[PDB]
């Protein structure tokens, strides 16, 4: 290109005319592909409105049984094909996937389409499209994105499954089917392999759900019939993310009422929740959920006598106090825990903490005082659930925490994340990149804790209408405590809307299961070696910025770990 | 050929090598692999030691049925050093899928496997996994190094003539080129399907105390259940039915195929598996609980009696009762069980009658009369093979005391006896000697087989600890697989050659049972002997070819 530009257009005029456009903009005569750039992107990219076109190629995926695998379709107009509301409408159609044996992954039960919608300017909200056929408006100078996910049943026959998604530019009012030789066809190939991801999650990830948020936003009084229906809706939706929900009400000095099941242990609904195979751990409340006639002592005695008989009792825990800060708080936990043990001695009490007692240090520095918390609490806490931020980037001080615990007597180390750690550590703050979100569970895996807790999934600012704007609480990084959105904000559905962050939590929990499989076959040192040598994850400040390492890892698990 | 003074005056016997000269280069980026390394194939029944002498390379022509493993070995011996600093050098091994003319495939993961043959106590025995499809092997001067190639044909595979290659490449120190040496594999998959359910129940014990000690897994723990689970699943590929085993006072045994309570979903995943021909039910509790021993037993049998797979149950209660008090504890124990289930099969191992009140004036005659003392409180009479010496004609004397039209069965076992030259699995015994265990079992016509132990090592407290053989026993007795962790980082068990010959033998039984089903007992017996495969306990083929003459004759005559 000369100094004066092609044909005298001036400086830098004509550096690629990326192939002349067709002179017509009529979608009934021009291929969709000459009207709109369409390409695929990996599930770990947060695909902004200004992402640049790439050339479309086929998509080749891998999934085990009981695994959700995902990819994205990006669309950016080249022209107006609807002069009067630019740029135009595209119709999106998907199809069953079919193997050689004639087995199928069906549209609707396995295969789903959602639009990726920005929250605070960042790609985050996944809003359902109509199946099998939907329409999507495309705007000038904007990249618009669809999240495709495929849920493989536990019983699915292995094989190579194949299918197509069809994108057609439409003329709006300026029947037939809209699909034609002018349509653009994206080719899908998924290999289902012999692994079944355990039905019961290997890592209990317990996630809190504010009941006050539900009570206010929906307008449902605690105890009511409508309240019980609303909590039911949330509990059932959340289990598909390989997590263990608990409802949570905060009290005086950060005491907590935490309950997985709002139903008395008597009720048939209690066993339907607690004996669900997908639920790895459930909170039992300390006080009564609904106002009773009994005293709490009296209620808890009778609740525990029932639950301790049931075969799911091994999944129970009590969570009594959120971040005890001072000596009175740590004493209160001992007292409450000992009431519990009098009705059943094998009860598991979960305590979260970032610090020893402020008013009576257990050692001359804060970190050292923190390390001794188990010496103070023993034997009145079983699950020592510590803040990851406390470690900074010192993965080598993990041993300092563990050296104070007694694994051989049922004590366990768990971790949580919250307003810290911050960039460039793994977390779920809005603005954090996709791999950074997924790296939360790579870190959890590497460090060797036996469960995980996240304080909040719906912890918005207060609102009194279902479709009210989602506002983020003051003093916290936006996204902290917020993994899903009300459906009514984005459509007329009552079904929750997932965040990208919740999808990358699930994918991370799927990765954990892969790495646990690899470990069960080749040992701890080899599996640690796989995580690092692939480039997936080296340390809290050093993990992959791209997708490809992740496929290298999951592909090596497939190559080596089949039966 | 050569004169007294040798070629060019090299001295006595110099220049008798007809080997054509070597190349003057040793650079493996320029010299064909075949000029740097001798490579040849051997049969699956040779124990190929480190001084096996090179043969000319030829094509491999194999036969298998559906649901059959077939095998061969690849032997490699360096001719020169191609890595001057670390002799002799490294070769890369690469396998590819096998394809028929119709386009069917036998695949590398699932079908074709490669393992290194490693010596144990100086004898070729352990089969240690190589990486697939590409592995590396260090070769050392003046030594023959050996790879075991096995091909598992799926039950549903299309008949056909499948073809492929294994490629061996000397490395410089992925790298395949025109210099690489190519071995040609041709496998005929024929019509026969080998029954999914083994036709002979071969029950194999697995010591639970060995697992608990060596892997540091507390009996009952969740880690223990995982460890037992891994062993069970791995052993079912060998056409055997495992049982875990703890010995008690005076050689009482607690035996159990499943560690899982009978109501647990995992119990029926094990016990209803089509490959499991017989399973052991424990007399007392595996995992200590609240119910007394009689209340546990009745509850368990009630659940099991109702299941479709209950015809496979048996109870193994005493290992080798030796005096009158032992034979009488068995009768008491059995009779307790018959109160809950009259139809239960009780299995008893023995080599002798009661020594303190003999049943007859000589020990062989006392042994033969054991069923008349135990009846009706044993249904499976499992007797020591060693007691017969080389007398196949005295089997009749055992069977004549049994009431086989009242579901009494005759099974056999081997152990520290019999010894050379009889068939057994003692380290040092020859390949076809190991395989002849099942030839003998077939010819003598018992309806089952038991082996006391497959992991019966001396005691150790770390997974990768040296494997030591128990005192007073021929090494290998009681040991058919090794810990994977001794040989790599893997938790998967390592098979012995002897376990592979056991499988080969069990596959031979299914070939002979097919020929019998078509042509009758007397023609089947004639086949076995007139091919040279097996004449009797001290006379059986020392070479592979008769085994192929036998299998090929079954293919030509039962190809329908
Ligand atoms: C277990 C936890 N306890 C605290 C919560 O109540 C919230 O304040 C949260 C905000 O990030 O921080 C920590 S995470
Ligand atoms: C059924 C058997 N019982 C005995 C076992 O307990 C071991 O002592 C073995 C040693 O070879 O010999 C016999 S075989
Ligand atoms: Cl055929």
Numbering used by the authors:
A (entry chain B): 11 to 184, 254 to 642
B (entry chain A): 10 to 182, 256 to 642
Text taken from the publication that reported this structure:
Beta-N-acetylgalactosaminidases (β-NGAs) hydrolyze the different β-GalNAc linkages of various glycans to modulate the length, combination, and abundance of glycans. Despite low sequence similarity, the crystal structures of these enzymes demonstrate that all enzymes share a prototype structure and have diversified their substrate specificities (oligosaccharide-releasing, oligosaccharide/monosaccharide-releasing, and monosaccharide-releasing) through the accumulation of mutations and insertional amino acid sequences. The overall structure of these enzymes is similar to that of CpNga123 and BvGH123, which consist of a β-sandwich domain at the N-terminus and a (β/α)8-barrel domain encompassing the catalytic region. Among Groups 1–4 and GH123, the DE motif is located at the same position, suggesting that these enzymes adopt the substrate-assisted catalysis reported for GH123 MR-β-NGAs.
In Group 2, NgaAt was active against GalNAc-β-pNP and GlcNAc-β-pNP but not against Galβ1-3GalNAc-β-pNP, indicating that it possessed MR-β-HEX activity. Thus, NgaAt is a different linage of β-HEX from GH20. The active site of NgaAt in Group 2 also possesses a cleft shape, and the second β-sheet of the (β/α)8 barrel is longer than that found in the other enzymes, followed by an additional β-sheet (orange). Consequently, the space around the 3-OH group of β-GalNAc in the −2 subsite is narrower than that in Group 1. Therefore, NgaAt was presumed to act on Galβ1-4GalNAcβ- but not on Galβ1-3GalNAcβ-. Since Galβ1-4GalNAc-β-pNP was commercially unavailable, Galβ1-4GlcNAc-β-pNP was used as an alternative substrate to test this hypothesis, and we observed that Galβ1-4GlcNAc-β-pNP, but not Galβ1-3GalNAc-β-pNP, was degraded. Thus, NgaAt demonstrates more diverse activity than expected and possesses OR/MR-β-HEX functionality. In NgaAt (Group 2), apart from these seven residues, W329 establishes a hydrogen bond with GalNAc-thiazoline, and L555 contributes to substrate positioning (orange residues). NgaAt was inhibited by 25 nM GalNAc-thiazoline and by 25 μM GlcNAc-thiazoline (a 1000-fold higher concentration) (orange and yellow). The structure of NgaDssm (Group 3) bore a striking resemblance to that of NgaLy and NgaP2 (Group 4) (root-mean-square distance of Cα atoms [rmsd] = 1.5–2.3 Å), while the structures of NgaLy and NgaP2 are identical (rmsd = 1.0 Å). The additional N-terminal domain consisting of ~80 amino acids, found only in Group 2 enzymes, was not modeled in the crystal structure of NgaAt owing to disorder (orange circle).
